[PDB]
Design an enzyme around this catalytic site. Structure first.
Site, PDB file in Angstrom:
ATOM      1  N   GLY A  13       0.866  -1.206   0.000  1.00 21.66           N
ATOM      2  CA  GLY A  13       0.000   0.000   0.000  1.00 21.66           C
ATOM      3  C   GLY A  13       0.895   1.245   0.000  1.00 21.66           C
ATOM      4  O   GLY A  13       2.119   1.102  -0.023  1.00 21.66           O
ATOM      5  N   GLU A  17       2.716  -3.211   3.750  1.00 18.78           N
ATOM      6  CA  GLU A  17       2.435  -4.304   2.811  1.00 18.78           C
ATOM      7  C   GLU A  17       1.151  -5.051   3.175  1.00 18.78           C
ATOM      8  O   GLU A  17       0.827  -5.243   4.350  1.00 18.78           O
ATOM      9  CB  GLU A  17       3.600  -5.302   2.734  1.00 18.78           C
ATOM     10  N   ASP A 120      -5.002   9.776  -4.851  1.00 19.05           N
ATOM     11  CA  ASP A 120      -4.103   8.855  -5.601  1.00 19.05           C
ATOM     12  C   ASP A 120      -4.893   7.824  -6.341  1.00 19.05           C
ATOM     13  O   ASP A 120      -4.617   6.621  -6.267  1.00 19.05           O
ATOM     14  CB  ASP A 120      -3.130   8.130  -4.665  1.00 19.05           C
TER      15      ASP A 120
END
Ligand SMILES: Cc1n[nH]c(-c2nc3cc(C(C)C)ccc3[nH]2)c1C(=O)NC1CCN(C)CC1
Length: 261
Positions: A13, A17, A120
């Protein structure tokens, strides 16, 4: 009845992880995101995740800290990343891209209605469940842009360059919602063409200058049908004030075109 074997690593991420975890007893699957605070920005991720509840948003089940190790317990999406459904140079069938786009917009309307900006949005962060329903994942870069009904402008540069809006490179402060819109437009481009149109939205990228000069006989634009293209003309507009908003995306002719059984 509730300790989980970490069965395999799924990737990383924004922070930490992610592992597939399976409940020994019940056989239930979740994703466990593992964040080494050693080897606050994570506190916010947890905080934001606790506000979220929507069918196009990766479910948050809880968190447990064990030393310097935050675990976040998240919906496992067994379909993987939208990224892996995009054929390089090709894209995917237009009806599939449309349904995903519709599901993207539902999740984004939801976020923005509770005053959260994701910051994002890209195919690596858009996950598919067992029914190929899309979920927005990873609130590590997310932030509050509206609180008690007052908007605040953003000033930090956050995101991933090929997906980022041009104002974020060009303005000291900018509105959060048209940033997320723009990055949804780059995702739709990727879905329909299997390529990203430029390395970043700067006049310094030839491809970006070409788009502003409307050279749509070039790739990726020539692979995209005239109807979705006309939507991308309204999303990928350099000035954020002239950019289409979600309510108007929802009125767009391609958006409303019947395509998919
Ligand atoms: C929160 C979550 N639920 N389900 C998955 C997932 N389910 C997955 C299922 C597969 C299948 C194909 C085994 C693969 C990745 C998967 N990720 C994740 C996850 O965060 N994945 C990250 C996203 C970012 N990427 C940069 C790295 C991976």
């Amino acid at each position: 009845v509730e300790d989980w074997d970490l069965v395999q690593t799924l990737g990383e991420g924004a922070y930490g992880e992610v592992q597939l975890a399976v409940n020994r007893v019940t056989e239930e699957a979740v994703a466990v995101k593992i964040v080494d605070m050693k080897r606050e920005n994570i506190k916010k991720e947890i905080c934001i995740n606790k506000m979220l509840n929507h069918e196009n948003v990766v479910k948050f089940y809880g968190h447990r800290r064990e030393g310097n190790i935050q675990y976040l317990f998240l919906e496992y999406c067994s379909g993987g990343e939208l990224f892996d459904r995009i054929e390089p140079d090709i894209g995917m069938p237009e009806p599939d891209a449309q349904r995903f786009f519709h599901q993207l917009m539902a999740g984004v309307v939801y976020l923005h209605g509770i005053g959260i900006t994701h910051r994002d949005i890209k195919p690596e962060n858009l996950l598919l469940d067992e029914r190929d329903n899309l979920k927005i994942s990873d609130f590590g870069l997310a932030t509050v842009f509206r609180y008690n009904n007052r908007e605040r402008l953003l000033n930090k540069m956050c995101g991933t360059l090929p997906y980022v809006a041009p104002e974020l490179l060009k303005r000291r402060e900018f509105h959060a919602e048209p940033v997320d819109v723009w990055s949804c437009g780059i995702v739709l481009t990727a879905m329909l063409a299997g390529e990203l149109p430029w390395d970043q939205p700067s006049d310094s990228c030839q491809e970006y200058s070409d788009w502003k000069e409307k050279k749509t006989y070039l790739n990726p634009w020539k692979k995209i049908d005239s109807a979705p293209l006309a939507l991308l003309h309204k999303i990928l507009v350099e000035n954020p004030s002239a950019r289409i908003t979600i309510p108007d995306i929802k009125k767009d002719r391609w958006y409303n075109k019947p395509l998919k059984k």
